Write a protein that binds this ligand. Structure first.
Ligand SMILES: *C/C=C(C)/C=C/C=C(C)/C=C/C1=C(C)CCCC1(C)C
Length: 133
């Protein structure tokens, strides 16, 4: 399925620290963030996505249209400009953020009743799993 609609709660988060270091997020932000349960809420209508990731701490809103290149300024992440593009490879949703960091982006797919999110930067891969609330 390409339907990723839902309120998804984080079950697991592997190597978030390595990914965040590859991004140059400061040590203290990394230390808080690694401990936090995330909730990802995806509103998907055709090609249009509206995403909100929420935690007790900081939140990140990301909206995009599949197949439509978009500028991003990653404020209160690593504060960089990237050229982002989200497309489908079969039922994997693939984001590539072109810019200063090598191999930036994330692969979003679907397996059984879970959402899998694989965040990449440089040589680092962070693997997250979410279940519907
Ligand atoms: C498809 C959903 C995506 C790509 C969600 C991405 C969320 C982030 C890149 C946010 C990461 C965060 C940190 C690295 C530090 C704490 C703040 C967060 C949780 C927004």
């Amino acid at each position: 399925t390409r339907d990723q609609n839902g309120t998804w709660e984080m079950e697991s988060n592997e190597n978030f620290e390595g990914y965040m270091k590859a991004l140059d997020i400061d040590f203290a932000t990394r230390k808080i963030a690694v401990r936090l349960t995330q909730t990802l809420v995806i509103d998907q209508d055709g090609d249009n996505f509206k995403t909100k990731t929420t935690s007790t701490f900081r939140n990140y809103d990301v909206d995009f249209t599949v197949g439509v290149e978009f500028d991003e300024y990653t404020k209160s992440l690593d504060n960089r400009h990237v050229k982002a593009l989200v497309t489908w490879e079969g039922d994997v949703l693939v984001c590539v953020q072109k810019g200063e960091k090598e191999n930036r982006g994330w692969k979003k797919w679907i397996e059984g009743n879970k959402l899998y999110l694989e965040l990449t930067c440089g040589d680092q891969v962070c693997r997250q799993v979410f279940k519907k609330k």
